[PDB]
Amino acid sequence: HAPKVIVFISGSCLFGAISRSLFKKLPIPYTVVLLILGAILGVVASNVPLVEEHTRDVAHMDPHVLLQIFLPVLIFESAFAMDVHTFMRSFSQVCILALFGLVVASVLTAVLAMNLFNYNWNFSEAMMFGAIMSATDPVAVVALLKDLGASKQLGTIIEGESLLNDGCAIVIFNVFMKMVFFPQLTSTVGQNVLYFLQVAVAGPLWGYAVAKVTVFFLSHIFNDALVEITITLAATYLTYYIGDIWLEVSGVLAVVVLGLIVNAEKTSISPEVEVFLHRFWEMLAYLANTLIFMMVGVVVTQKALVAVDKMDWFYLIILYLAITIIRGMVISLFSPILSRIGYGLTWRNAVIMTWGGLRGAVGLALALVVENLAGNDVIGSKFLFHTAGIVVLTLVINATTIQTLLRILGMSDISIPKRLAMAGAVRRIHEGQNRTLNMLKSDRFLADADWDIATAACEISDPYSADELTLGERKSVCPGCKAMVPNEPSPREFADMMEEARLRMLKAEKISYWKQFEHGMLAREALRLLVQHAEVAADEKDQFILVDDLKKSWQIKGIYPWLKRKLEDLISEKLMYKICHHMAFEVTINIAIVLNIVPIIMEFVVQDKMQKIEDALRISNYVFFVIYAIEAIVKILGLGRHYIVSHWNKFDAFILVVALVDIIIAETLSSIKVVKLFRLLRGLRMLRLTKALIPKLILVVNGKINNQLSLGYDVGKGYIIGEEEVGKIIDRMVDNKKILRELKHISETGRLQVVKELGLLQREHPGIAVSVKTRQAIRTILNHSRETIHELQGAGLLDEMEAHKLELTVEIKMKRLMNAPSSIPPPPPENLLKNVSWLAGDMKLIDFIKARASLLHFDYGEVIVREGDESDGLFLIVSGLVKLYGKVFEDYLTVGNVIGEMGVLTKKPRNATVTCETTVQVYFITAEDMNIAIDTFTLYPSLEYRLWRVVAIRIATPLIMEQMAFQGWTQEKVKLHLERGYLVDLAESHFQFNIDATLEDVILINGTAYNAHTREEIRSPCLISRTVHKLTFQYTATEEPRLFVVRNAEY
């Protein structure tokens, strides 16, 4: 008639809602009172027949549809909630701990059950009991570990051990369930090891295959969220169902691998789809847990509680104690092996993970499967009663005492920098609330509002609210503006000032890294590496953030460059030629290859079975595909040395002669013919799929190298940008001079080393580096366009729907950018000469510079630029990396920069010396050609204006970053603000300039200016002070006074 199942599911939803709402403050989890409510519902169902009808329709469910409905959701959410980078960083330890602890804990619990329980269980049923018992589902422990500050890696350790524990526990449970409940099978040794191999490898391989197909499908979906959600759900359920039923493999491990790969590659999912998928899968797992606990309670009080004794409760208590003891001995036994890992466990983490073994819904569902499979036997009832009791006892006692245990062991204390940061944030929020309240007290609409309720509601308080001696010492090392006492430093006081300066540097570097993350410049994993290295340097005595510990991020070496180099070596290569030159023949032979492949596998199948003489041997295999299209028209009639020298063409010659042997065997037309036909087809397929397969492996290897190079470039850029900002802010926090000099020296040598190593990193792999730089440039342009769209929307100049269309356009472009070519070929030096910032617009000027350019090759160690020598040319680095030594500033100039602007402009001997750190090719425009180019052009953007604008940007950027370092704008914002401005001509201004209030900054780039009604004649190029009202300029020959301002933006 009508479904009672929807009534039970909605009732479980409402009961879970009341359970979650009413038990927020209590430390008892909502699952235990869900079990209590399920037991109450089961006993009224045993009394009242209508509730008996509802519970008999739902809770007396088949074991199979119980597994295939609830298990994929729980397993996929456990895999998808993971921090997969931290899990993969400690994957060996988690894998060995979970796997070996599962095996030895299952046999120990099995031996315990056989030696302790009165029931005459055999060895296999006892491993089934141990497999149910050792499956752990801690969620409250991982929530407490994520919430309570430090030991963040221990929660990932516990979660990964739990996920692999659940997967392999259901695997060993299914193995012994098939052993016990269905004992009709008798097997040999070979079939048994084939079954073990099939389960163990064909779980993860099937999961890997469906995960790769799903990632490929999700990479090619734009502007449709609902389809992405449906393929995630359908891929999970289809992977589990096809693996468990059709392939007869372990489907739990397939969903584990699929969830780990989908959580690993989260970038082809759109971010709103990603956050909805996280919330949606958490909601689905909550639904599964609530339903599972309610049916567990119902069948426990209906059938599992009809056969219990006092000895059963005693066995439950001894089983709980021995399960905790067994897990403790497992961890204590594997402690040295787990200790010789890069994240070794302490005694506190071992005790926490011992007590964090909370048995959950997975073992309860397996106990339901055992109960329904056993039938009227008491084995399922005993399994169900002991599993429910172990779950209840572990949940209650372990949860309350794990909160208490985290309190006592000293892993719940808030750290002093976190406490100071939270106190400062709370004080800032309080000051802002007071200022907003004083604003709202003098507003005409809101003056009459009662303010007692306003201060009662809007009151943020701080959550945190030998240690005293340490805090007193840390406050004692503070020679700041709090106290005004002049003195002379002491050597011990110098040691404390050294330490305080070093911690202030590392703390400011952590703020630099978080500022880089919040502005969409750093990656998240790069941020975690830089912050981790900063805090590791902070925990040591004198160790700064070194470069050797940062080089491991961009260590490109490994399996993948060796694979790339060897596959490049295999496919390096070297009238009738032109049709081969079009390359459209090769795709036709490849499609012909696959259309040859599949039906000869069918003919293999039909002689394995051994109709109309099998279709007359399938028209003699289409006369062997018309003898391979007459051997590709006799290889287009024997194209000479091009066919002669290629070993690939040598085995196509082998193919054609073996096909001629197939002709003479058809002429002979027994057993030798079939085996040789087998060898023909298998060889043909494998060595002709190899030519298609090798470039696909080349792109896969290039993608892996691209990911590693992107991480390394992101880490290096984060260190360099943070080191720039910290070296620009360091003057305020450090008062001593020699301390400042030492700190600047280490900062500069680290900066130079990282810039050099990134330059040689670009030199090593050209195409991959060009690909990651193109990807980062497109991402930066798209992010700033999205910010422009948001600022146009927030200013009211664009309505909501049209702004949403523009954001959808840039988001679709970003998703296309995620599916990029992994190795863009490097551009020619003509293209790099074309794309120069002072040479972008004018095409005629591009033709003149190409007519006047000479490529000049230099070896290692030659000098390009001499300081004493007069300026005779311009240089453009098209490849290679150069060093600079100048009077002392040291920098390394990369590909696409220009060397010599002020030399060719203001006619002075060169300021620096440039040498080659690798072999370099530069474009040399001789100075007389620069002068005839500078004369022959009179457009509104002129080369004189463009070159002076490029150099004006370069000098003005760190000088503006000096003043705004207190304000905290990054270098990118300074460059974007300065990019808005233009050089202003004094010839139109009659050599008198006025400063306006509208002008944000005024920087003179070159020359001497008079200021403030001849108050002082400023010779040094710098930012013109706002105190200066106007500047009057004087003509001096070859002085050429250039000032570069920006105006404020107008809506």
In the complex, which residues of this chain contact ligand CMP (CB under 6 A)?
865, 871, 884, 886, 889, 891, 899-903, 910-912
Q: Which pair of tokens denotes residue 233?
A: 């759900």
Contacts of 350 (CB under 8 A, 6+ apart): 331, 332, 335
Establish whether 972 is an annotated binding residue: no
Q: Nearest approach, Cβ of 911 to ligand CMP (angstroms)?
A: 4
Phi, psi angle pair for 683, to nearest 5°? -60, -50
Dist CA 708 CA 761 (whole Å): 12
What letter represents residue 714's amino acid? Answer: D
Q: Nearest approach, Cβ of 1003 to ligand CMP (angstroms)?
A: 15
Residue closer to ligand CMP (CB basis): 927 or 983: 927
Residue closer to ligand CMP (CB basis): 96 or 927: 927
Q: Nearest approach, Cβ of 579 to ligand CMP (angstroms)?
A: 52
Dist CA 175 CA 198 (whole Å): 12
Residue closer to ligand CMP (CB basis): 167 or 1021: 1021
Establish whether 581 is an annotated binding residue: no
Residue closer to ligand CMP (CB basis): 748 or 901: 901
Helix, strand and coil content of the chain, in percent to the nearest 5, comes to 70, 5, 25
Residue closer to ligand CMP (CB basis): 535 or 1040: 1040
Q: What is the DSSP string of 704-734?
A: HHHHHHHHHHHHHHHHHHHHHHHHHHHHHH-
User: CA-CA distances (angstroms) from residue 817 to 261, 699, 772, 786, 822?
Assistant: 20, 16, 11, 15, 11
Dist CA 361 CA 395 (whole Å): 11
Q: Which pair of tokens denotes residue 931?
A: 């002068």
Residue closer to ligand CMP (CB basis): 910 or 946: 910
Query: How many of the other CB atoms lie within 10 Å of CB of 805?
Result: 10
SS3 at position 26:
coil
Q: Nearest approach, Cβ of 884 to ligand CMP (angstroms)?
A: 6
Q: Exposed e or buried b for every residue in 1018-1050, given b needs 16+ CB within 10 A?
A: beebeebeeebeebebeeeeeebbbbbbbeeee
Cα–Cα nearest to 127, from 137, 144, 142, 112: 112
CA 692 to chain CA mean position, Å: 30
Phi, psi angle pair for 327, to nearest 5°? -65, -40
Q: Nearest approach, Cβ of 337 to ligand CMP (angstroms)?
A: 53
Residue closer to ligand CMP (CB basis): 910 or 1042: 910
HSE-up of residue 614 (Cα within 13 Å, Cβ side): 16
Residue closer to ligand CMP (CB basis): 51 or 955: 955
- The side-by-side arrangement of strands in the sheet containing 898-899 is 855-858, 920-926, 873-879, 898-899
Dist CA 207 CA 236 (whole Å): 9
Residue closer to ligand CMP (CB basis): 842 or 901: 901
Q: Nearest approach, Cβ of 892 to ligand CMP (angstroms)?
A: 9
What letter represents residue 1033's amino acid? Answer: F
HSE-up of residue 313 (Cα within 13 Å, Cβ side): 4
Contacts of 929 (CB under 8 A, 6+ apart): 852
| Alpha helices, DSSP H, located in 117-223 | 123-133, 140-147, 152-180, 189-219
Residue closer to ligand CMP (CB basis): 52 or 891: 891
Q: Nearest approach, Cβ of 536 to ligand CMP (angstroms)?
A: 32
Establish whether 911 is an annotated binding residue: yes
Residue closer to ligand CMP (CB basis): 823 or 871: 871
Contacts of 476 (CB under 8 A, 6+ apart): none
Query: How many of the other CB atoms lie within 10 Å of CB of 502?
Result: 20
Residue closer to ligand CMP (CB basis): 811 or 891: 891
Q: What DSSP designation does 395 have?
A: I
Residue closer to ligand CMP (CB basis): 709 or 876: 876
Contacts of 573 (CB under 8 A, 6+ apart): 646
Q: What is the DSSP string of 397-428?
A: IIHHHHHHHHHHTT-SPPPHHHHHHHHHHHHH
Q: What DSSP designation does 1023 have?
A: B
Q: Nearest approach, Cβ of 762 to ligand CMP (angstroms)?
A: 18
192 burial via Cβ count (<10 Å: 0-12, 13-18, 19+): exposed
- Nearest residue to ligand CMP, using CB? 903
Q: Nearest approach, Cβ of 724 to ligand CMP (angstroms)?
A: 12
What letter represents residue 125's amino acid? Answer: E
Q: Nearest approach, Cβ of 635 to ligand CMP (angstroms)?
A: 57
Establish whether 434 is an annotated binding residue: no
Residue closer to ligand CMP (CB basis): 94 or 899: 899
Establish whether 902 is an annotated binding residue: yes
951: left (phi over 0), alpha (psi -120 to 50) or beta: alpha
Residue closer to ligand CMP (CB basis): 716 or 903: 903
What letter represents residue 689's amino acid? Answer: L
CB 394 within 8 A of CB 133: no
Query: H or E stretch including 487?
Result: none
Strand partners, 1046: 1001
Residues annotated in a binding site for a 1,2-diacylglycero-3-phosphate: 1
Please give the annotated binding residues for 3',5'-cyclic AMP, written as ranges: 900, 902-903, 910-911
Specify binding-site residues: 1, 900-903, 910-911
Known binding residues for 3',5'-cyclic GMP are 900-902, 910-911
